[PDB]
Amino acid sequence: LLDKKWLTFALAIYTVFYLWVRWYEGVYGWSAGLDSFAPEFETYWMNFLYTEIVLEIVTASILWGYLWKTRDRNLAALTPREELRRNFTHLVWLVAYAWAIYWGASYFTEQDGTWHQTIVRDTDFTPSHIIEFYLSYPIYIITGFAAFIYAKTRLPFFAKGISLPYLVLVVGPFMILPNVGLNEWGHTFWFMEELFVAPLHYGFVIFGWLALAVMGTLTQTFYSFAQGGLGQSLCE
Amino acid sequence: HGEKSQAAFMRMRTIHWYDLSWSKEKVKINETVEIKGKFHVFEGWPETVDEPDVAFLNVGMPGPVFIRKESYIGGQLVPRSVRLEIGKTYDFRVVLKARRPGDWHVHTMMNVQGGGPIIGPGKWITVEGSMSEFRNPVTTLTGQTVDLENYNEGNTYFWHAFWFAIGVAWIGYWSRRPIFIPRLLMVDAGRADELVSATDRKVAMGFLAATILIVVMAMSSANSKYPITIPLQAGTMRGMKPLELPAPTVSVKVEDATYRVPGRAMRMKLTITNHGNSPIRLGEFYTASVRFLDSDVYKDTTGYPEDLLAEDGLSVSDNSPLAPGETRTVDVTASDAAWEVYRLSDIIYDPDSRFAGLLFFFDATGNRQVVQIDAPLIPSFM
Amino acid sequence: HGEKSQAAFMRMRTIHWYDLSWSKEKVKINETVEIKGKFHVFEGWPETVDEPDVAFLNVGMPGPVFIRKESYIGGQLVPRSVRLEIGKTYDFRVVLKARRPGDWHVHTMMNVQGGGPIIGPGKWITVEGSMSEFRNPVTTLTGQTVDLENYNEGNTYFWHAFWFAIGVAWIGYWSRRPIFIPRLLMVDAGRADELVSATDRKVAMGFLAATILIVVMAMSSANSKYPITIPLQAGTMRGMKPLELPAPTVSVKVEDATYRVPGRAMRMKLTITNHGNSPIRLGEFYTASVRFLDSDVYKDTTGYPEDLLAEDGLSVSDNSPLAPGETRTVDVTASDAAWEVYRLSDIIYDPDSRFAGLLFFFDATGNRQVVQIDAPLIPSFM
Ligand SMILES: CCCCCCCCCCCC(=O)OC[C@H](COP(=O)(O)OCC[N+](C)(C)C)OC(=O)CCCCCCCCCCC
Ligand SMILES: CCCCCCCCCCCC(=O)OC[C@H](COP(=O)(O)OCC[N+](C)(C)C)OC(=O)CCCCCCCCCCC
Ligand SMILES: CCCCCCCCCC(=O)OC[C@H](COP(=O)(O)OCC[N+](C)(C)C)OC(=O)CCCCCCCCC
Ligand SMILES: CCCCCCCCCC(=O)OC[C@H](COP(=O)(O)OCC[N+](C)(C)C)OC(=O)CCCCCCCCC
Ligand SMILES: CCCCCC(=O)OC[C@H](COP(=O)(O)OCC[N+](C)(C)C)OC(=O)CCCCC
Ligand SMILES: CCCCCC(=O)OC[C@H](COP(=O)(O)OCC[N+](C)(C)C)OC(=O)CCCCC
Ligand SMILES: CCCCCCCCCC
Ligand SMILES: CCCCCCCCCC
Ligand SMILES: CCCCCCCCCC
Ligand SMILES: [Cu+2]
Ligand SMILES: [Cu+2]
Ligand SMILES: [Cu+2]
Ligand SMILES: [Cu+2]
Ligand SMILES: [Cu+2]
Structure with missing residues (x-):
């Protein structure tokens, strides 16, 4: 069996959900979504914000908790074939994390940019903030935390210690979410200009660099893959 | 649509728009609507806003549902930022050409270099027609008439696709062979010195030489075509003529x-x-x-x-x-x-x-x- | 000679020099040539140039082939930087004393604190004679007449040579013995603690004490001689009187x-x-x-x-x-x-x-x- 079709679902769920989100914001961007003080905004976007925050908290709690209670206690008595299967499942988790990172840190982030040269901001909760700051960033944070927890609880290589590159890869991109406080403060009191290269945005940049720990994470996963199931073939 | 969120006192004391007029309330695609009026720069300009030494006469709209054909401060076109004097009154005129069908809230706004946007009154203007009918012709000093909606689009697409294909070809050439785990194990276990051997170096030399040659040849070709070019025109315009009110x-x-x-x-x-x-x-x-x-x-x-x-x-x-x-x-x-x-x-x-x-x-x-x-x-x- | 390289539009709109006059075209050493005229500060001052809030009336020449005896904006001497108002017209006068023989292209220029040099028209002026004949006398408020060409030269030479000799003496005292390889080997191989032994410490104490004592005594001596000194005089001059043109x-x-x-x-x-x-x-x-x-x-x-x-x-x-x-x-x-x-x-x-x-x-x-x-x-x- 080895790599199963959980990978197809992992790609497809993010793709379908974010295509629906993009359609939703393309329909309710103008026409209930330009004016933040209108009552139609309160039902089409503030409700979206509240619902997405509640669902994010509930989903994160359920997913991380389930992964933690179902952790493997007898890691020593794990066959190499089962370890290979678990390594492939962890690779699927990493694929889902990469897809979520793309959607959050590239697509919706530069989409907030398009909106920055068309409107004048009315609040910290513009239609694009609902989708980028409070939906896609939490989604990829949840996915990354889940991948880290899965590695730590199922893979013996990633057990017996917290991996530093994995911790950086999981937490640094998370740190962009509290870096939103810098964004709003850096737009209100500081730089009234809609400059997208202002130092007020370097907080995302600094913690966007921490995603380069994916390289250390990936060589760690390669070594975990090549523990018992290294071959043979490889190096022969 | 950006007002109601700015501070009330700073909306009260920055710029007073009056004598506003809109030539039309409903327009077709490619038709023109003209917005006129006067604005007075308040003497008690707030200290938290920089003085309008560098200001831009902008239009508040949800993206380019209109295109700004012309804009005047006084009687003269102002495509760049301008210098305004605190306490003076200026007359302005903005000419818009309808581009996107719909109902749009159009504001006259002023952007100040160190204080942000000063939004004037917004008026709902209806645009009827289809976006496919919109044209933006312009005649160059080289004697060519082009449409700004699609000029250079194909050239941009071609060059970006070409360079993307070159990069993809490089990566794919290296990706035909096994990529990560065997190469990692070979580099770890002793010297690798086997994963990069000729004709890999020949292919890399070819890629480097072809890249430099293509860049040079394309630059020369883009200089033969379009032999006359000018840099981007920029610079704040001083000498805005204010109104001489009694x-x-x-x-x-x-x-x-x-x-x-x-x-x-x-x-x-x-x-x-x-x-x-x-x-x-x-x-x-x-x-x-x-x-x-x-x-x-x-x-x-x-x-x-x-x-x-x-x-x-x-x-x-x-x-x-x-x-x-x-x-x-x-x-x-x-x-x-x-x-x-x-x-x-x-x-x-x-x-x-x-x-x-x-x-x-x-x-x-x-x-x-x-x-x-x-x-x-x-x-x-x- | 610095023009022809600056941007044409900024040469066109910074400062307009007119009514220029040169008192002489050919001068001898120690003779005076006077450059007069008016300059108008353009109202459309470019934004990339800081406003002439701090400006200096300079002379364009290849080094001090002339010395600037005097320079006036309005009717008053301007040895420091001045504040100019955009849109105003000022009359200027520069008095030069010939110093170096040759044919020199003399410009009237204006330096702006945040925009660089604004060079006016250049005129070829011939200087005849010998540089050895040039004198720059000046009478101080202490009642002494000195020549600025060679005043304090011997004192400067003496003090610099004296301190250089002191440093060379220190280095040579340490350089009489072997320098690099034996000392490196001694410091490496066990404790050295033999390359610095008395009377080396006594010599170092003598050098330190003599240095401090000589500095203090020389300062006191230079205070007894020249008991009256003032700090360097600096500061932008406001209140430049402009021309009142009809x-x-x-x-x-x-x-x-x-x-x-x-x-x-x-x-x-x-x-x-x-x-x-x-x-x-x-x-x-x-x-x-x-x-x-x-x-x-x-x-x-x-x-x-x-x-x-x-x-x-x-x-x-x-x-x-x-x-x-x-x-x-x-x-x-x-x-x-x-x-x-x-x-x-x-x-x-x-x-x-x-x-x-x-x-x-x-x-x-x-x-x-x-x-x-x-x-x-x-x-x-x-
Ligand atoms: C990591 C955990 C993430 C948790 C957060 C996820 C956010 C989900 C969306 C919030 C919606 C909201 O809050 O808004 C509720 C909106 C408000 O619109 P309305 O006024 O009813 O108008 C009608 C709007 N139509 C035309 C879109 C119906 O309506 C709804 O009922 C529709 C919400 C459907 C969400 C489920 C489909 C997702 C795509 C399919 C692949 C997964
Ligand atoms: C328990 C789960 C559900 C609730 C979840 C929270 C949703 C938002 C609640 C807003 C309450 C309120 O009062 O609004 C917010 C009030 C202003 O209010 P206003 O001027 O009336 O806004 C009117 C305009 N609108 C209708 C669009 C809101 O201050 C603020 O701008 C707070 C801004 C904080 C920015 C930095 C946040 C960084 C987060 C980092 C995370 C790691
Ligand atoms: C709407 C939210 C639905 C999320 C569904 C989560 C599924 C449950 C997570 C999980 O534990 O594994 C699911 C799959 C397959 O791995 P499993 O083998 O089921 O995991 C346990 C490993 N073990 C069986 C050896 C003990 O592992 C995966 O690769 C699933 C990837 C799912 C993509 C992440 C979605 C997160 C969105 C916020
Ligand atoms: C918010 C920012 C996060 C700060 C980063 C700190 C965490 C980084 C290190 C880390 O993740 O380790 C904690 C454990 C891994 O196992 P250990 O740290 O070895 O300890 C396990 C026992 N413990 C679950 C009580 C911690 O991992 C888990 O056990 C997490 C799963 C259990 C939590 C589920 C409840 C949370 C619901 C919201
Ligand atoms: C790898 C990222 C892909 C992002 C594509 C995207 O944003 O799609 C939205 C856009 C919307 O334009 P359009 O297709 O014309 O449909 C408009 C529907 N709304 C306005 C809701 C987006 O086009 C599509 O939906 C094409 C489907 C691509 C599937 C990978
Ligand atoms: C790593 C490079 C950081 C350079 C910071 C920078 O470009 O700041 C520009 C800004 C100059 O402000 P300016 O660009 O004139 O802003 C115009 C718009 N307002 C007046 C509203 C802020 O300077 C500061 O206020 C101090 C920045 C501290 C950085 C740790
Ligand atoms: C207004 C001048 C701002 C200067 C900012 C300097 C930033 C340097 C970062 C080390
Ligand atoms: C080392 C490659 C240098 C290429 C220079 C090409 C100059 C062409 C002038 C048009
Ligand atoms: C430790 C040496 C301090 C020297 C002070 C000399 C003061 C002299 C006053 C003229
Ligand atoms: Cu934004
Ligand atoms: Cu509006
Ligand atoms: Cu007013
Ligand atoms: Cu010259
Ligand atoms: Cu002039």
């Missing part, structure tokens, strides 16, 4: 100005002294895009946006004609739902409870005078 | 201004309105140190530099006298080899294709009027 013959002293919390009205006590030689009557109070009118004195015929217009929102305790030389004190109430809809009542949240505005006085013959008032604005709770 | 009775509107690429001419269409009560005729166009003259109207007698002077470089389509009250539109061509020699045609490379200049109108009685023009400058290729 000195008002009305002097107004705001002796105490208050407002109820909560409430939809603002109350002020004014001592109006009428100089000149004609009886005057107060007809309008403009504070921040909101016009409070005394219907017995003045009626709006310019199609001012209804939500910003209070036809009988200005009540004067004694609005009888003021004979020349005569001075009197009256209580003036500016009341409308706009005061709460546009969050002018949100001044209680501001760290500077001061207001500014324009009073328009009209005589019997109809000619009008603009006087500017500013005073502390004191909330009242009991 | 308001021009000529109004000129530049209706379209172009230039051929390539070419040596600039063409503009002007609507000239003649107020006042005397027939006027256009006699000169000054753009950037280049004077285009209509020889039928005005002739230069001030010895303006020939390469910057176009005696018949200004052609007016209808330069008949303009009766008072009459307004007319003419085509004006400013053509000379100077337009390409001084790279005024290099404006096509600039990110701001705008020009500025001065028009000089002359009446029958000879009195002249200065009007300022500025407009976009449009290249023409076909």
